[PDB]
Design a protein around this ligand. Structure first.
Ligand SMILES: *C(=N)[C@H](C[C@@H]1CCNC1=O)NC(=O)[C@H](CC(C)C)NC(=O)OCC(C)(C)Sc1ccccc1
Ligand SMILES: *C(=N)[C@H](C[C@@H]1CCNC1=O)NC(=O)[C@H](CC(C)C)NC(=O)OCC(C)(C)Sc1ccccc1
Lengths: 300, 301
């Protein structure tokens, strides 16, 4: 079988706290003796329209920040700002802090999101960083400060902190250094994204997943060159496929005996002909939020 | 569409996963208080699995034949018993991470989160729906048996599924935590097959309510139907009939939208009998059936 699978979220759950400033409450990430959260927690509804954050922050004191880990208040003993993230120093260390690193992910890479409200984890799901640097998440009011992550060995690599929704219903946020993915800003304005494209290497991985699980109706006897495939891909607002992508897809090619460029010829046919009402792995649309690694890990 | 399969945070279940080994056969177990629950076929050799006599295999077993480990730390077994297709191993340590919990038997259509585990180590979490033919469309590899499915209500974990088997069609079958299989399956390495599946009507209705909540309501009509007339029609399209419990669990969405359940049934009947005619609902020409009414409330509100 084949499902969108998230990483087990327990190591991150043990880090989630609630942060309140004024009448604004959102989530923070408590690692060692520092709580990370979105800096717009310090804004009023008036401030949000055009916030001078350095000016707003210098007017705040440590005691204006209420941090709760469950039923327990954590005392803030210092604060600083790093881009769009606020770092609240507290007087106690989190014993549940996992081994962790902060990473900035590339478009096309996937990660798990732990959606939280009032410091309490609510749900976990898998996302991709889109080529236009949005993510297609599920986030409601109070979700800011929810984080995205991957787990490798017992190391949690944090890559995303949630800040905003766009009018189209997609989402935007920062890495854990507080730098946005994409051309977005933490002000209360309607913001559009650049034109999105489909993550081609991921669609190919997913087609190989469909073969592994006995779905082959979309295959064909033909082949294509890499450049001729990329010409068609770009026409259809698909990302180009690089030789590194082809290399990355090797194991799936070897496993199934279908050459990468043969699978490219299959996808080319699907882009030009459509699915004609058929489905692949249950989906009526081509799925692009499984990486080659995601498919490998889950199929072997 | 705006909706996606969302799992429950898995930490409270991660803290209960162990591994159980008999001989060279290792699968996963669930450690709650001082009991470990796991599939009874852990006591089988690969050759026993072809035609096991479980009562006879068990009488030959002693407490000291069971290796239970949390990570690489052994948990001493002090008692053992069989309950249907589950083995209960009493251990000498109460799990300090035991959450508030209950054991529940779910109905077809209900969704739950699966924490896929190998050698007692969690690999991934995903949302599953119990199909009307009592299979789930999981993602499971060798060594996954004993992985559990669950829902979390407030702080209480309701365990509903323990994994035992993969069928030829690639779907999965298992038990509740009292060891009673969902559906007509048995824990023996003998050819078995899933019954013909059907569409989960209550969940399609939940999906239509979700569409309405998001302002996509072209499919609403001025008509209604009786429950019996709808059920008889639905079965001709390989949709499940509705139960009274289904009507009841659509109550909150009906109240939220002001659309009576049977009026929504009449709208669905028209979609079944006339097709979409090229239109979409929530951006899809396909009707989704693995979001329950509770799931829709979770993601809309
Ligand atoms: C953090 N807790 C929220 C999370 C948002 C709320 C709803 N879903 C989400 O992901 N973040 C915000 O509310 C941010 C805060 C600013 C200071 C960055 N603002 C935001 O996301 O606004 C969304 C819009 C602009 C209201 S979209 C819209 C525009 C016009 C008409 C209808 C909708
Ligand atoms: C538990 N660790 C495994 C999980 C299986 C392994 C691969 N993916 C899975 O979900 N459970 C088994 O191997 C069980 C054990 C018996 C005692 C129930 N056996 C099993 O699932 O085999 C399938 C059947 C019953 C033989 S049906 C079938 C026939 C032919 C081809 C495929 C399936």
């Amino acid at each position: 079988g084949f499902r969108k699978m998230a990483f087990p979220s327990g190591k991150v759950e043990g880090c989630m706290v609630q942060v309140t400033c004024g009448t604004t409450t959102l989530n923070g990430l408590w690692l060692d003796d520092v709580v990370y959260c979105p800096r717009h927690v310090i804004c009023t509804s008036e401030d949000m329209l055009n916030p001078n954050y350095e000016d707003l922050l210098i007017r705040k004191s440590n005691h204006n920040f209420l941090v709760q880990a469950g039923n327990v208040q954590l005392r803030v003993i210092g604060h600083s700002m790093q881009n769009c993230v606020l770092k609240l120093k507290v007087d106690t260390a989190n014993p549940k802090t996992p081994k962790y690193k902060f990473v900035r992910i590339q478009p096309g890479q996937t990660f798990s999101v732990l959606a939280c409200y009032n410091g309490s984890p609510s749900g976990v799901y898998q996302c991709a960083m889109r080529p236009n640097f949005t993510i297609k998440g599920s986030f409601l009011n109070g979700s800011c400060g929810s984080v995205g992550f991957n787990i490798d060995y017992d190391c949690v690599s944090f890559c995303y902190m949630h800040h905003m929704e766009l009018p189209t219903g997609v989402h935007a946020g920062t890495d854990l250094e507080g730098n946005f993915y994409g051309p977005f800003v933490d002000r209360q304005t309607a913001q559009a994204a650049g034109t999105d494209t489909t993550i081609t290497v991921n669609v190919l991985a997913w087609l190989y997943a469909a073969v592994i699980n006995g779905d082959r109706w979309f295959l064909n006897r033909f082949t294509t060159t890499l450049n001729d495939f990329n010409l068609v891909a770009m026409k259809y607002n698909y990302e180009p496929l690089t030789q590194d992508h082809v290399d990355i897809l090797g194991p799936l090619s070897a496993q199934t005996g279908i050459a990468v460029l043969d699978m490219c010829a299959s996808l080319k046919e699907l882009l030009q002909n459509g699915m004609n009402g058929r489905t692949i792995l249950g989906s009526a649309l081509l799925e692009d939020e499984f990486t080659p690694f995601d498919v490998v890990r889950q199929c072997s």
